[PDB]
């Protein structure tokens, strides 16, 4: 058995159900919250989102967040150098992943 890092989006096995978590992450990345960080794409990070993920958070398995926020479907498509990105912290991402892995309900559900 090969364990998957706790920061991987592959932790949800269905590509359709992962869409809700991706939507939540993208919606947060475009907001104007007060504990985001502003990062510009450097000239040596055009094709390598892993380098950006390591330089910002210190974790290399968070490259899917960088690919999502930049606006690309493919990792081989180059990013625009100098694009302004806003990226959330890591504990928030881990908490969202845990919630959607073990509960899997919409953020605004009403229960009794």
């Amino acid at each position: 058995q090969y364990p998957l890092s706790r920061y991987d989006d592959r932790n949800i096995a269905d590509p359709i159900l992962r869409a809700e978590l991706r939507k939540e992450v993208m919606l947060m990345c475009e907001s104007n919250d007060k504990n985001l960080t502003i990062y510009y794409v450097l000239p040596d990070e055009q094709y390598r989102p892993d380098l950006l993920a390591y330089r910002m958070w210190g974790i290399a398995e968070l490259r899917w967040v960088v690919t999502l926020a930049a606006g690309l479907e493919d990792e081989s498509q180059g990013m625009t150098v100098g694009k302004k990105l806003k990226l959330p912290p890591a504990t928030w991402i881990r908490e969202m992943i845990r919630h959607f892995q073990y509960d899997g309900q919409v953020i605004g559900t009403l229960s009794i």
């Binding site: 309900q105 919409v106 605004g108 559900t109 009403l110 229960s111 009794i112």
Partner: peptide, 23 residues
């Protein structure tokens, strides 16, 4: 018969309301 209620803080222009899985 069972009921659930939700208050409104502002006008969100669509204001979708979603029930639980069990309900």
């Amino acid at each position: 018969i069972q009921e659930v209620t939700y208050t409104v803080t502002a006008a969100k222009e669509f204001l979708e309301v979603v029930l639980s899985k069990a309900l």
